[PDB]
Each structure stands twice: as structure tokens, then as C-alpha cells.
Amino acid sequence: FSPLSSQSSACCFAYIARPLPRAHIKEYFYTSGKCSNPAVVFVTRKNRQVCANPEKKWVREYINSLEMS
Amino acid sequence: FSPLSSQSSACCFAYIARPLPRAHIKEYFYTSGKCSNPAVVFVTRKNRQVCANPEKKWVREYINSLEMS
Amino acid sequence: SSACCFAYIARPLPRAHIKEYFYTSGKCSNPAVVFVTRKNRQVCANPEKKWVREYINSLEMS
Amino acid sequence: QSSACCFAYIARPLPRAHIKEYFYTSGKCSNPAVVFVTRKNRQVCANPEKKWVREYINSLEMS
């Protein structure tokens, strides 16, 4: 059955304008397709969730730098 | 200027059907008006964020109980 | 997991996405109508909601 | 010391009817940006590279 979860999902309503410091990032995820806007969230060392636009090259490069491939 | 923040916001897409055990809840918040659905999130002691319908009696009662705790 | 619903969709499902529906077992602690969607999702909904009580008839008028 | 730059851009296009004016932030700013002013006088940052942003401006210009 669905919704597989009654748990909340992180959604984004703005996109950070300039790349945040790569060293401040520890993890990333793509937001749920249920959200109104497509986004990538970067999780900082202090556990903040910064929203970014999936189409941006820097966002994709940071993802590459966080993935083992 | 707006957006005032680049951080994500927790949104809800389904509402838990049966009341959660009151003892398992430690905090609550209403989700952002930017989300598509209005909702209350109850934070459990295991830190799960469970979505609930703001219009239900048990939900408003649990909120009042938390506020007085 | 279970054959029983634990939560109800917060917003009505667009009518065109619905292919079929069924009720869960009367044994389940929560009463529910499940909609089978175009993309084969099984969505739990509150049988009390006005939109549910019209998406069903809309699927059973014949 | 009177903040006037955009640190983030709105993600979803603003309702065209809600916007009455626009301006670009200064070259002093770390990021280039368009600020749309809504009829309730909210000032919202947007990405100048986006099609909807460029279209709103072109529309705002003609009238």
C-alpha cells in the first residue's frame, strides 16, 4: 500500500544562487517527486539542508564528488 | 529579499490513520504554508516525523497536550 | 508492512489516474478504500472524505 | 551596509499577474539576479538565466 510512508519529506522552494563550500557538504539527496519543485538537497556538516537546482553544472559536479562513481 | 532561506521544508503527503501513542510524541510543528497540503508533524522519541491531519480532534488535542507539557 | 492501510492520502487523487478500487479487510484497524492507479500504485484513502465517496460511484455507476 | 543582493532564487515561477515591476541587483553583488516586485510589494529574487524570468521581463517592458 501507499503512501508507503506517513512520514514527512523534505521539499525545496528556492535554489541557492552560488555554490556553497564543497567542504561543508557531507551528503546529498534528490527531493521526493511528490514535492512541487525538482531539487537536490545538500546536507551540511551541521545538518542543514540546502536546496539547489538539479540542472546546474556545479550541483552535478558536487554530486559526482560525493558518489563513488 | 525573498526567498529568505535556501533551506528545505518538511512537507506532508499522507496523514496517519490512527492516533499515535501519546507517550511516543515529544514535539510537534505545523508544516510550512509553502507545502501543498496543510499538516501537523509529530516528532517521536525515535525522531520520526509523522504527518497528521490538522482537522482531526485527536491531533488538536495532542497539540494542546504537548503545549502544556 | 500489511494488507491494511496505515495512512490516508492528504489530497484527492486526480480522477483520471484511477483505474480501480477496493475496500481493505474489515479486520484492519483502519477502514479504507484503496485506489489502483494508472501507474499501478495502491493508494489508501479515507472512506469518509467526500471525494472518495464520489470517485467510487464514478467507478460503479454501470 | 544595507543588504541588496540575492542569495537564493525562487524555484517555482511567480504568478505573472502578481508582479508589477522588476529590477536587477547591482554588479557589486556576488550573484547576478532579477528581483520581481509583487502587488503586495514583496521583493523576490529570481534567476536571470531562466526562460520564465526573461519572458516576464520582456512582458513587463512592452507593458
From Swiss-Prot, chain C:
Disulfide bonds listed in the record: C4-C28, C5-C44
Q: Per the record, what is the consequence of mutating G26 to A/K?
A: No effect on inhibition of activity by tick evasin-4
PTM-bearing positions, type Methionine sulfoxide: M61
Q: Which domain of life is it from?
A: Eukaryota
The protein's name in its UniProt record: RANTES(4-68)
Natural source organism: Homo sapiens
Instruction: Report where the shown chain sits in the full-length sequence: first residue, last residue, total length.
Output: 33 to 91 of 91
